[PDB]
Design a protein around this nucleic acid. Structure first.
Ligand SMILES: Nc1nc2c(ncn2[C@@H]2O[C@H](COP(=O)(O)OP(=O)(O)NP(=O)(O)O)[C@@H](O)[C@H]2O)c(=O)[nH]1
Ligand SMILES: [Mg+2]
Lengths: 614, 205
RNA sequence: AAUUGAAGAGUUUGAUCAUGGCUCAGAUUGAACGCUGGCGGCAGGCCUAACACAUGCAAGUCGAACGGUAACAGGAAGAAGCUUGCUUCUUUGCUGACGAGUGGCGGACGGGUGAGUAAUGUCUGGGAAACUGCCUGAUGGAGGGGGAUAACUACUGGAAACGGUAGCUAAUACCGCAUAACGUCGCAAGACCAAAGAGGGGGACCUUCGGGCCUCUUGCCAUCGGAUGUGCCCAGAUGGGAUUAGCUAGUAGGUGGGGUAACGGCUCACCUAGGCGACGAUCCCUAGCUGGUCUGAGAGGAUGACCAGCCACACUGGAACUGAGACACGGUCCAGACUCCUACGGGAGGCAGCAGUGGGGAAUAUUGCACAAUGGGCGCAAGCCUGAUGCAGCCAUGCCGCGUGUAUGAAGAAGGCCUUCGGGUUGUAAAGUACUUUCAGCGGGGAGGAAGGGAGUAAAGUUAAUACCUUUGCUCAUUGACGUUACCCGCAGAAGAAGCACCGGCUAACUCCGUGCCAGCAGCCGCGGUAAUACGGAGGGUGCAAGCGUUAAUCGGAAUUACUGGG
RNA sequence: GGAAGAUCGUCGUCUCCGGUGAGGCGGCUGGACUUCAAAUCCAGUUGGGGCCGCCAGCGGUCCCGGGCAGGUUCGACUCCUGUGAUCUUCCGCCA
C-alpha cells in the first residue's frame, strides 16, 4: 500500500511520517543541516501482516520538482497534506493538478495544524477542500483532520491505509524498472534503488541498462527494507546489479528492462488534458516520471499535441506525464504518450485521417494493429516496443486470425490481396512496357512492386498468387499462361525476312544483323526469343541454326553407337565433311543439354530418343 | 568453419577443375572460367612466384576443404614423421575420410561427404564418426548406417562413381554401398600434376 | 622406433660494387583496445597498489580421557488432569546424547604472495657432528601414593572489554614414592631415570551385591630399529656496474668457559695479528631461484605466467615462550601507524585464503553449490569438520571442432561497375528444382563415474567360553553437487547462425568518381601540384575466419658481439 | 541531486549598448584581385521555426531569432526575474 506524501513545504509531512513509521527521511548531511526536505526521503511501515506500505516524502519546491518527478513514478496512492492554518496552499493545488493530469486512481487529503486552530476553522477548511476536489474533477476523497504531533487522527487514518489497493500486474508484461538512486554500498557493488513499472526480477536475471546500454546481472534485491530472492512491480525496489556499467554513465531516470530498446526518439505525439488550452509550437518543460526534458508543443485536432524533445527518451504507449511552462511559474497541462514515432508533416492531407484512425479509434493493440496495417506493413519490433509486449504478448498476434506474418511485419490478408492486385496491374504495365518479353522474374517483381516492403511478406504474397494460378512460371521465368511465345510484331517483322535466310543456311549474329540492317543487341534478343519459341538453336554463343538441321544432326549421331561403338571427332570428316570446330561445338551443346554426355574417350546416350531400334 | 559461398568462382580463380561440383559434369567449362575470373580478368595476369605457389596451396586446400592452421599442423607433423614429407603427407592426406567417401563414390562431392558424415549417417567399425579429416587406417572397413541406405542420392552418385573409374587402391563391394579401404596411395598412382614440394618450401618461410 | 634440418627483401649514387646501419615479411603472448561475434570441448583468467578493506565462510575434532546435565529424546517414581490409560506436570544422568568446563590431538598440514633477497638462498655433486611426534619392527616394563584446580557454588569490578574475591571437586591433567638396564654419565667402581588406564564381553568364584575376578582390544612408560622428513657443513654453478680498488678488530686462528638436538666466534674471556682482494674484494644498482616456457637448424638468446621443487613474507617493527615440529595467514606479549567501539576511564581488529568492495590502471571473474567423489584432521568405526578438492558460473582471452545447408540450376536476370557504348563483370550466384536436419530447440528414453560403507548372517581364528573381538564369504536396502550428465530416440523447418583486414612496391590481390602538396594516409621506400593503380568513397578482387585487425613484448631473420659464426 | 559561479549572438572574439541595434577584432568562401602572396573593400558566414507545395531529394508562407519564456519600461540582446542547457568549484550520495 504505497502512499506518497506530497504537499506544501513545512506543513508537518515529516512529522506525520515519524509518527507512523519513525523513519528518519534525511540522508544527506545538508538536509540534516538545513532541516527541510530538500530532496526525497523514504519511509516504510513494516507489519506482521507482511505488507510494507511505502512512504515517499518530497520537496514542495519547483526547483526541486525534478526530484519529486523522480518519486511520482509508480504511485499506488497519494496523500496531500494540507495545514489547517492557511488551508490548501498554492503548491498543494499545483500537486493536485499534477495528479489529476497523471490519472492517479485515488488521493487522500490530510489536514494538519488542527490542534492550533479552533474547530470552526477545521470545518471551514474541510468545506474548502471538498469544494476544491470538485474543482479538480476528483471523485472519492477522505479528508482526515489531525495534529500529527498529537497522534490525533491516527486511528481514523489506519482504516483508510488498509483500504488502499496495491496494484495488481499481469504476468505478461515486459519487465521495466525506473532507476532512482544509484549509491554503492561497500558490500556487493552498485545497489541502485528504483520503482518497477512492470515485471518480476531475480538475482539470476540479466537486465538491460538504458543510457549506458549494458546488460547487468542482479546481485541481490530488497523488496522494501525486506531482502528477498525476487521482486514484483508496484513497489520501490532496491536492486543490486553487476555488469560492466559504472556510476559515471548511470543517470537517474535510466531504465532497467529485460531486452534492448530501440534507440530513443525525440519526436512524439501525446494526448492533452489541460486546465486551459496550449498554443502551437511553444517551448516548455516536459516532466515525466524521473525524466526532465525540454521541448516545443504543437497542436493537432483538439487536445492532440506533438512534443519535440531536445532530449531523447525511452518511452511507451499510454504513459502520462506533466508539461509545465519553460520558465516555470505555472503548471499548465498534462500529456499522454500515444504514437512513439510520428512522421514530419502532420497536417498533411493523407496523414490526418490515419492519425484519427490510430488514436481515437483504438485503445487496444489489436485495433491499432489493424489501423496500422491499413496504413502499411507493421514491423513486430516497433509494435512490441510501443505495446511493451513480452514474447507471451508477442504470440497473441499469432493467435489472431487473418494476419499474415512473415519473418517480421504483419500485413492484413485482404490488404495483402490488394497488394497482389497492385502487383498484377504493375505486371500488366510491365508486360505492356515490353510486349515481347515473356516476363519478369520473382525478385524483379518484388522490386517492381514493393521494394520498401519486407522480402518475406512480399515473396510469400507472390507464392499465394502462384497458388491462385494467376501466372505460371518455369525455369524461374514468370509468365502468363496465355503466352505461346508468339511475341510482339517488332520481332516478327525481322523474323519473316530472317526465316528463308535462316533456312537455306543460318548465320552468326553479327552477320545476321548486317544482312537485315538491324542493331546487334536487338538482333540477338529477337533471335533468342525466337529460340525460346523453339525455332532456332544456338550450338554456341552467337551461332544459331534451324530445327530441320538439328533433327538431321541427330540422324548423323544415330549411326555412331551402332557403326563405331565410340564417339570421337574423326567422323566429322568421315561422315559429311563438317569441320572439327563445328562438330565439337555441336557435341558440347548436346552435352550441356543431355542429348549426349562426355566421359573419357566417348559420349553416352543415357536419356534421349536419338537411339535407333537396331 | 565451412566456406559457404559460390564454389566454382573460387575454382575459376585458378582456372582449374577442382571437382567442387559434379553431377553430369566435372566443371561446366562453358561458364567462361578462364577468360573472366573477375572484373579485371580480361587482361592476362602473369603473377609472381609467391602468388603461384600460394594460389596452388589455395587450390589443394580448397579441394580438401581444410583450413590453414590445421593444414599447418599437417605440415609440422609431416616434417616430424621420418622420411619424405611431401609423399607421406599427400598419402595420409588422401587417407581423409571425406576423400574416401568421395572415391567410394557415394557422394556427389567431398563437400557432400561433409554433409552426409555431419548427419551421423556414417558408421566406421560399428562406431559413428563426424570429422572428415580422420585418416582411416589401411585394410579397415567402413560402412554407412543402414537407415542412410535407400536415399536416392547415394545411387545417383554411384552412376557418377562408375563413370569416374573409381580407385584401384580401395575395394568397394557396393553390394551394400559398403567398401573397405586398403592402403594409402603411392605418389606414382596419383595426380601427376600437383607438385607438393612447392607447398613444403612455401611453409619454409 | 626415439628424427628430417638453417630462404630473403627494400632503402645512401647519375650508374656500379662494397661497407654499414634503419625497416618489413615469421613465430609467440597470462596480452590490451578497435570492428565483428552462432555453438561445443579443453585450458587460462589483479603481470598495476606487498594499496586499503564492509559482510559471511575458510579448523576443528574426540563422552571409547575426566567431572557434568545446559538443551533434546527415552526411561523412572510421582502428579491424577480426563477423552480413566489419551493427556496433564513434578522430580529423576539413569540411558541415548552433548551445551559449557577440564583434558588429548590437530592449529608448524594444505592455501596466498614474490615484498624482501646477489647468499644465510637455489641447483648439482658430496659429507659428518644431529634430530625425527604420531606409522611400522624388535626388545621389555606397566606397581603403589599425594596435593590442587577449571567446571560448579556465593560475592564482586567495569559502559563494554575482560576479570577479580572466597569455597567444593574429578581426571588417560599435575606432583611424589617404589622400582628398571641391553639406556645415560663414569676408565672403572658406582649413581640415576618409568607409568594410566579406559572400553567390550564373560564361565566359575568373590560382590562393601558399585564391583571384584577371567579374556580381548587399545591406551601409558623404557631401549634398539626402520623408513621418511628436518637441521648442519663443504665443492663449485647461479644478474649488471671499475666513471666502485681498497675493505674488515670479533673480522682470521688459539686455549678455556658458555651455548646447540648437533659441528662451529654461535657467544664470552684471554693470547696472537691476522683475514679478503683484478680468479674483481669492498661498495653500488637490479632481482626470489630452479625444473622449465617461448624462440632457434643448431649452439645459444630471452624469460621464470600455469604446474612441480626450495627459500622468504603474512599491516609495520620486534620479542620470546608453548610445542616432535614456529619465532607461528586466520597463536601470545610490547610498541607503532591505520580504522572501529567506549558511559572517555579504556578496549577491538588486520582477505599477499574462498568469494566480494573500493583504489591503482589500458585490463583480469561467482558477496555460488556439494562434501556425491578424491584428499586431509580427529575418532573403534559410523560420522563430524574442510572455500583443500570436485564441479558449476563468467569472458572469443587462448588451443580445437562444427555449423551458418550438397546436388543440378544460363534464356549468364535486375542493379552496380567499366568502357570503344558495340559488350562484358558481379554469377549458377540468386530464383527454380531434387534434397537435407549436423548443430540448436522441444518432448521423451537413458550408461558410467559409485569403489565402498551399513545391517544381517555363515565359516575360520582368538578366548575357560557356542561370549566379545578380528578376518573371509553370502543376502538385503543404500551413498550423485555434477545431472535436465554422456548417449540415443524421435518431431519439425535451412529453419537459430560470416564477418574482419588488405588491394603503389616490399607482398598475393584494380577501375571510376570525389578532393586538388588541401582534406588526409603512412612499418619502410614514400604519395596527393585538376586525369592520385598510395588520400576519401563506390563497385570488384585478395587474404584470414567465428574470429579479423593496430599497439605492447621476446627470439628469429641480425653471420648486425660473429664458440660453432666478424674485422 | 543541492549551493554558488561562468557561458549560451545572427560564423567566431571583444566593445557594448534601454531609443531601437550597432561597432571594433578575427577566420574562412569567393568576386574586384595580382606570377603567387599581402592588402583593401565588396559579397557572405543566413540563422531558425509552426504551416504550406512537397519529397521539392527542396522551395515558399508568415513569424522569429543575443539559449528560451516572462514582466517591466513609454520601448529591451540591452533592466530584471526565471528557465534550463553547457561550464567552474564545492557540499553528501548510507538497501
Ligand atoms: N501544532 C502542530 N504542529 C505540527 C504538527 N505536525 C507538524 N507540525 C509543525 O511542522 C514542523 C515540521 O514540519 P515537517 O514535517 O518537517 O515539514 P515537511 O512538510 O515534511 N517538509 P517537506 O514539505 O520539504 O517535505 C514542526 O516544527 C511543527 O511545528 C502537529 O501535529 N501539530
Ligand atoms: Mg519534510
Amino acid at each position: 500500500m504505497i502512499i506518497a506524501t506530497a504537499g506544501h513545504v513545512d506543513h508537518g509531512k515529516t512529522t506525520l511520517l515519524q509518527a507512523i513509521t519513525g523513519v528518519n527521511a534525511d540522508r544527506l548531511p545538508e538536509e540534516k543541516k538545513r532541516g527541510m526536505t530538500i530532496d526525497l526521503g523514504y519511509a516504510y511501515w513494516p507489519q506482521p501482516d507482511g505488507r510494507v506500505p511505502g512512504f515517499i516524502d518530497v520537496p514542495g519546491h519547483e526547483k526541486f520538482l525534478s526530484n519529486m518527478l523522480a518519486g511520482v513514478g509508480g504511485i499506488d496512492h497519494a496523500l496531500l497534506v494540507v495545514a489547517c492554518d492557511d488551508g490548501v496552499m498554492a503548491q498543494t493545488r499545483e500537486h493536485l493538478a499534477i495528479l489529476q493530469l497523471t490519472g492517479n486512481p485515488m488521493l487522500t487529503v490530510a489536514l494538519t495544524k488542527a490542534d492550533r486552530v479552533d474547530e470552526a476553522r477545521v470545518d471551514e477548511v474541510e468545506r474548502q477542500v471538498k469544494e476544491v476536489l470538485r474543482e479538480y474533477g476528483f471523485a472519492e476523497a477522505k479528508l482526515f483532520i489531525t495534529a500529527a504531533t498529537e497522534g490525533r487522527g491516527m486511528d481514523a487514518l489506519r482504516e483508510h491505509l488498509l483500504q488502499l489497493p496495491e496494484r495488481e500486474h499481469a504476468s505478461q508484461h515486459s519487465f521495466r524498472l525506473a532507476i532512482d538512486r544509484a549509491f554503492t554500498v561497500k558490500g556487493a557493488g552498485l545497489v541502485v534503488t528504483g520503482t518497477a513499472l512492470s515485471g518480476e526480477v531475480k538475482v539470476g536475471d540479466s537486465l538491460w541498462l538504458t543510457g549506458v546500454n549494458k546488460p547487468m546481472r542482479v546481485r541481490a534485491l530488497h523488496a522494501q527494507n525486506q531482502p528477498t530472492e525476487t521482486a514484483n512491480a508496484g513497489q520501490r525496489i532496491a536492486l543490486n546489479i553487476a555488469g560492466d556499467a559504472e556510476k559515471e554513465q548511470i543517470n537517474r531516470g535510466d531504465w532497467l528492462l529485460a531486452d534492448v530498446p530501440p534507440e530513443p526518439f525525440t519526436r512524439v505525439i501525446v494526448e492533452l488534458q489541460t486546465h486551459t488550452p496550449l498554443t502551437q509550437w511553444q517551448p516548455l518543460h516536459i516532466h515525466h516520471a524521473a525524466s526532465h526534458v525540454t521541448g516545443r508543443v504543437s497542436l493537432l485536432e483538439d487536445n492532440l499535441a506533438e512534443l519535440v524533445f531536445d532530449t531523447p527518451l525511452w518511452l511507451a504507449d499510454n504513459d502520462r506525464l506533466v508539461l509545465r511552462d519553460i520558465s516555470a511559474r505555472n503548471t499548465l497541462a498534462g500529456a499522454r504518450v500515444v504514437m512513439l514515432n510520428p512522421p514530419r508533416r502532420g497536417k498533411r492531407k493523407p496523414e490526418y485521417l490515419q492519425w484519427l484512425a490510430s488514436l481515437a479509434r483504438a485503445q487496444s493493440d489489436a485495433d491499432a494493429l489493424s489501423v496500422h496495417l491499413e496504413r502499411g506493413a507493421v514491423n513486430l519490433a516497433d509494435f512490441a516496443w510501443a505495446r511493451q509486449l513480452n514474447g507471451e504478448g508477442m504470440r497473441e498476434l499469432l493467435q489472431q486470425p487473418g494476419y499474415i506474418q512473415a519473418g517480421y511485419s504483419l500485413l492484413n490478408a485482404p490488404v495483402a490481396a490488394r497488394w497482389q492486385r497492385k502487383i498484377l496491374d504493375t505486371l500488366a504495365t510491365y508486360h505492356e512496357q515490353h510486349r515481347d518479353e515473356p516476363g519478369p522474374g520473382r525478385e524483379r517483381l518484388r522490386r517492381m512492386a514493393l521494394p520498401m516492403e519486407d522480402e518475406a511478406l512480399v515473396l510469400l504474397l507472390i507464392e499465394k498468387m502462384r497458388e491462385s494460378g494467376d501466372i505460371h512460371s518455369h525455369h524461374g521465368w514468370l509468365h502468363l499462361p496465355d503466352h505461346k511465345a508468339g511475341f510482339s510484331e517488332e520481332q516478327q517483322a525481322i523474323w519473316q525476312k530472317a526465316e528463308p535466310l535462316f533456312g537455306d543456311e543460318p548465320w552468326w549474329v553479327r552477320d545476321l544483323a548486317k544482312e537485315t540492317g538491324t542493331d546487334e543487341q536487338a538482333m540477338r534478343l529477337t533471335l533468342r526469343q525466337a529460340a525460346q519459341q523453339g525455332i532456332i538453336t544456338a550450338i554456341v554463343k552467337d551461332r544459331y541454326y534451324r530445327n530441320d538441321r538439328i533433327v538431321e544432326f541427330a540422324n548423323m549421331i544415330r549411326d555412331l553407337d551402332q557403326e563405331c561403338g565410340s564417339t570421337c571427332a574423326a567422323d566429322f570428316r568421315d561422315r559429311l565433311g563438317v569441320g572439327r570446330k563445328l562438330a565439337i561445338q555441336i557435341l558440347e551443346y548436346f552435352d550441356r543439354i543431355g542429348f549426349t554426355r562426355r566421359r573419357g574417350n566417348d559420349h553416352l546416350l543415357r536419356d534421349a530418343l536419338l537411339f535407333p531400334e537396331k | 568453419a565451412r566456406y559457404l559461398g559460390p564454389k566454382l568462382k573460387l575454382s575459376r580463380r585458378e582456372g582449374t577443375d577442382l571437382f567442387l561440383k559434379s553431377g553430369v559434369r566435372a566443371i561446366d567449362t562453358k561458364c567462361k572460367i578462364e577468360q573472366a575470373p573477375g572484373q579485371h580478368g580480361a587482361r592476362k595476369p602473369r603473377l609472381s612466384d609467391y602468388g603461384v605457389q600460394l594460389r596452388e596451396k589455395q587450390k589443394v586446400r580448397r579441394i580438401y576443404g581444410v583450413l590453414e592452421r590445421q593444414f599447418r599442423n599437417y605440415y609440422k607433423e609431416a616434417a616430424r614423421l621420418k622420411g619424405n614429407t611431401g609423399e607421406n603427407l599427400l598419402a595420409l592426406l588422401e587417407g581423409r575420410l571425406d576423400n574416401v567417401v568421395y572415391r567410394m563414390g557415394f557422394g556427389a562431392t567431398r563437400a557432400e561427404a561433409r554433409q552426409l558424415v555431419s548427419h551421423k549417417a556414417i558408421m566406421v567399425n560399428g562406431r559413428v564418426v563426424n570429422i572428415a579429416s580422420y585418416q582411416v587406417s589401411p585394410n579397415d572397413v567402413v560402412s554407412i548406417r543402414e537407415k542412410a541406405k535407400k536415399q536416392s542420392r547415394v545411387k545417383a552418385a554411384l552412376e557418377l562413381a562408375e563413370q569416374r573409374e573409381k580407385p584401384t587402391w580401395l575395394e568397394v563391394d557396393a553390394g551394400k554401398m559398403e567398401g573397405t579401404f586398403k592402403r594409402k596411395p603411392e605418389r606414382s598412382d596419383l595426380s601427376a600434376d600437383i607438385n607438393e614440394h612447392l607447398i613444403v618450401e612455401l611453409y619454409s618461410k
